[PDB]
Symmetry: none
Amino acid sequence: CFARAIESSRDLLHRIKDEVGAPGIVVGVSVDGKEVWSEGLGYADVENRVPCKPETVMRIASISKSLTMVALAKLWEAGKLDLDIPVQHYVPEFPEKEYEGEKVSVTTRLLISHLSGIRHYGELYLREKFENSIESLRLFKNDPLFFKPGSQFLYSTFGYTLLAAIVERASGCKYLDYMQKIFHDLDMLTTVQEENEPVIYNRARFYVYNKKKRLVNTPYVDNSYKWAGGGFLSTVGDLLKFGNAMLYGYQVGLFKENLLPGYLKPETMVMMWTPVPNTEMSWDKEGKYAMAWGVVERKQTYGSCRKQRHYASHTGGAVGASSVLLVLPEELDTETINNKVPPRGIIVSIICNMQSVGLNSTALKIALEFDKDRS
Amino acid sequence: CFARAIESSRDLLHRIKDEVGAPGIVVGVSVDGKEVWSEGLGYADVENRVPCKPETVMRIASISKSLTMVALAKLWEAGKLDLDIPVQHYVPEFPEKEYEGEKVSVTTRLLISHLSGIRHYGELYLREKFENSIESLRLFKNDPLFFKPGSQFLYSTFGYTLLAAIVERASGCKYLDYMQKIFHDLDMLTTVQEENEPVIYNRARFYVYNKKKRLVNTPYVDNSYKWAGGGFLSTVGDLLKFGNAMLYGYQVGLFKNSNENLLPGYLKPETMVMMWTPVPNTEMSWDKEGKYAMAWGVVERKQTYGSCRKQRHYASHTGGAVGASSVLLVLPEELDTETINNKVPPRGIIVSIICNMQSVGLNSTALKIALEFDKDRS
Amino acid sequence: CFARAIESSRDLLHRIKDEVGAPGIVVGVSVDGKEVWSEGLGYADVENRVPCKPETVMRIASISKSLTMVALAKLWEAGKLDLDIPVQHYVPEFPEKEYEGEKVSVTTRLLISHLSGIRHYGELYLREKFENSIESLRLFKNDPLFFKPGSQFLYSTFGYTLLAAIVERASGCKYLDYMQKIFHDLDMLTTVQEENEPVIYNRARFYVYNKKKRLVNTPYVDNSYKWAGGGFLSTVGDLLKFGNAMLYGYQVGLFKNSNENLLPGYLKPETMVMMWTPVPNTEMSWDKEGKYAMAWGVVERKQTYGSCRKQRHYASHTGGAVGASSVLLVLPEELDTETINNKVPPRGIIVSIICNMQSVGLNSTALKIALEFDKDRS
Amino acid sequence: CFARAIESSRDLLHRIKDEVGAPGIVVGVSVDGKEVWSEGLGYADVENRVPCKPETVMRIASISKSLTMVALAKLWEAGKLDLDIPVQHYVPEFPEKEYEGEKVSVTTRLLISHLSGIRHYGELYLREKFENSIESLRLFKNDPLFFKPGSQFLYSTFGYTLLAAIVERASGCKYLDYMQKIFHDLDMLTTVQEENEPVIYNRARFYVYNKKKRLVNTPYVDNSYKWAGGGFLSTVGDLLKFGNAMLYGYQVGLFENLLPGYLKPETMVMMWTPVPNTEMSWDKEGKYAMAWGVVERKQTYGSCRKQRHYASHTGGAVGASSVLLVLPEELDTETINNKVPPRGIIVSIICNMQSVGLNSTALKIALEFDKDRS
């Protein structure tokens, strides 16, 4: 079975953990829809000596963007949401932006791929509480657009707060309630917004290093202003379920009524996993950014050279935490299409409670190891 | 030995824990300078399932006042502090105060016993960081006095922040460093100010109940504005050491003639006696039969009528912080001639209790536990 | 079996390793002269995935100073070295010095305890190879004194290479050969000077953190210019043997007259006593309570106040080298009449810790581990 | 399969390892573009008992020259570099030179085949760090030319530092980043410059024998003054990929619907033609061409040894030796119409022992694997 790739993956995890000095790390690897590995190293709570384990929940920062994109796709399929219309139809509160003396239009399709003119404020240590997304909009609504929309890519987090407001306006219900329903459908029974008052079991702590090269606690923050693009807590097992559901929907149309319908239509998944031009993927130079995901295509330019592998990932970095979720579909031959059943691929999710750690390469290597073994 | 009082005290702890619904509680009982019991029930961290244990650190709201009293007494003994001079001699920042048209004086001994006119603002959920007590003084400096100083008792917490500023001015060093030196001298190795950035091992979590009768986490707070009262974390074994040191300092004077090779107390016997004499025109909130000495609640010994209850002498202090409650109680024993001649101080029982639940009265339970352990003495 | 103590220590090691982010750590604990625990956590070589183990050899920085003081003590006992004569008798290469108005005398004993005027150059990343200590003396021989000798304490490392030159001059043999003889006598079969060319088995790698908070390799350095301080590599098992020998030499005289079949110590009881006596006007950086005895940090026993902290007597030394930290600590036990009458030396606990991470304070952790092992005893 | 040639090749590796007394050796053999064998014998770290394995990274000394020649060929194809103009057009820092009292000119193509007048300095145990090749040029810029350029061959390594400076000037970017892009394209994900500070996983140790015939560690050296020749750390699997890319580029021109080579077939054939008045050290039969020792195909007399055509390169660094060898197969009509490039065998060997010649062993292993083929 997989008794060889597990040791190699554990070695890789120990490598990254020693390189960044993370107090703890958690990994989950699922192959072909079955969870084959789930490991935890280190301590989730250094003060109370709580070990890391599969049940540990941690901050996921940018995976929230993919989770919100799922809601956007559901609204698009239901017909309540149009991507090409300007967002002022949904949100009159957002002012009609004008760039350099010419009226420009900001649309959902343009703003999902971070292609709008909204500038990147960066990490802000807000400790305030926001009740609804419309109130959260006041942080950046008055500010002008940095670029001309549709002309330049600029990674921004408040754009997905605007997307959450759009979800509230279109779905007719609260954004948090809609995402809770989506999580219940996807069986992600532990994914929940990051808030202080409720008792959330197996909640980890998030650390950083100070100027004396010592491990300390991160400052208290409230991610209410950005439940999208941040503010979500989950286990590795829930990210595995999310990735497996996404992969199944993508491959279901190709596979041929024993097969159940995919969460989203095959066309929706195809649209969601196509890279857009003039757009770059920060954590992988070979890939581009597509619909709240980063997509690397298959291409071999020259003979006997590097052949890229098609995969879709997303890395998130929150205050005192880092995470990655990566999906690697397998090559679909005629025989497997004839006799095998989707999903056919590998989903790897890695989360650590240490700031500014790049976990894309480790996830890619672990996925490649488990793909080598397959069987 | 104490195999009977332990079970009774554990039953009392279970009683109070089930009555208030506290997630966890920790108790420490020390008899005659030797720690004889240290127990923890429940969970210190409900989310991560961390059990309570003697090593758990929790918030002590009003014990900090007695800890600051230790520093003030040391400064008085060193001659650097005068209790009768007005506080403006030490801190010029504090404005002069006039009450219905006559100027009044705020003095150290008066503001210790909460007899000054500074009003009680109550608990304020501050999240701001304060560097020194001087900048912390801006929260209440401009407000006028509520009462005539020396005429009425009104429990207050910012008065001890003013006291911390006075300690900084008098000792010539930072208040936190002075208290660290004092804790090092007293062997309280886990007493530390409550701040978020450093890694403090065995830190507990503090809970409350919401309007739906469910357990929730308390809001994040920063207690830098009041390091002097409510600003410290400690274990039960550290409060036991503090109480044992205070008891030894209080009793060494009587026991001196018998051995004459006894180490001196941390403070002079006269200083401890002054510290544990209740002041008149003052009330003790958590015990009606006592008064409020210097940063302590003292219940005297007296029997007004024959065949009637006789008050037992003891000195306690209870505190309530956000999501936590605590008590520290010292019960000295009656000193016969035989024990003065043949025994060695301290002779008494110190009981400390800490629970991670808001607004819990642990004074009566501590007194009952102390009485159990006293009955089964030797 | 000291199981509870072992577990507590493992927890403490994990605590310090996580706090500093050290790739690997190795501990050795010896109780009453028998080696009771030896553990290694992490990786000695991160690139090649080599785990830490008791056989791992790491840089010991300032323990080399105690090892050199052993040689100086042997020369003192043999009568070949005078601690009061000026060093210019042994090393004419070192020039005579005048501090301000008057000429001054630098002696062996005054220079052992860092009380001379030699200023602290700090760590220099020198890659040049030195053959003999005389040519190593060229780095600081011309420079004047920073203070008047005997008037101020200043920690220095080049004082100990001057001591190595003194050892060569007095003994008449090479310093490395004399230290090799001493290591062979004490059964420290792994301790050796740190050099690149020879094949030293189980050699570890030493790491640091860069400006991007990533683990990187420390720059290549050559430690030939300071063999006496910072020039040696050893395991924890060798430091345990060294500490056991020192403790036995310290306690053999006390245990005399009872089962006096006792073998003599390596160093005379008077020599060990004067070795572990603190000197005044001198400080010990890694413990404020202690002072600096010759090549050692000594904390004496004292209780100023009743029911207050009582200081425990112990002798340690911590060292920090490029990419490595280490500590060696000796905690003797108090000698009652029964243990002197029946037991046999050594009676104490020795703890040695080495980690391949720069700027780590391991003194407090080692003291805590020693305290746990002393609690368990039996 | 190849279950017979593997045993013979292992025997040959044992022979060379025992003859030179190397602590460890690593081999990689790729047949027809697919890696068929990869083995490691001995210990990469004698002190810590770390065995040699296919993932071990070791120093490659003169294979860096071929890697740099790949960048030079890319610049040549892009039109940014002209070989025949004097190098002073690219690098004004290099002074104009007189030999025997007359002006002489040094060109890039003359400098590639070591035909220039730059003298051979040999191994220097430097420990200084150089930021860029421009300051690295100070080691040999002032010294006059030993021979008249174009008149006699002299193996020199600082000429490739000059070539790295030329690459920096011409490409408009740093030499290191250009080579990194080339490595990433070629799928050589383990090749990296040899530096001390960063953590390089599976880094080996390099040994030597002292005057007492005992194994000791080599002195610490810094190869920053020699990034272009030397100063590179790669596995055998990376050299296999490099050789496969070169062979495919060499053969795709002769061979439907195939992906193009990394370099044009004209560029590859220009790379693998020997230059006259030039000698190949590790094989007296062949000559030295464009950072590749090439042995041509020729039978002088009937019923006598026929020379087999191949291209190799050996390198010797402080405490390490390496060889990369490419043996193309003879292409008849059947293999042209029924097969896909690359057809041939690539053999790479690396050991951590100073002054070891591994060319003969690599050639023998390639010949064994060519015998079996199938």
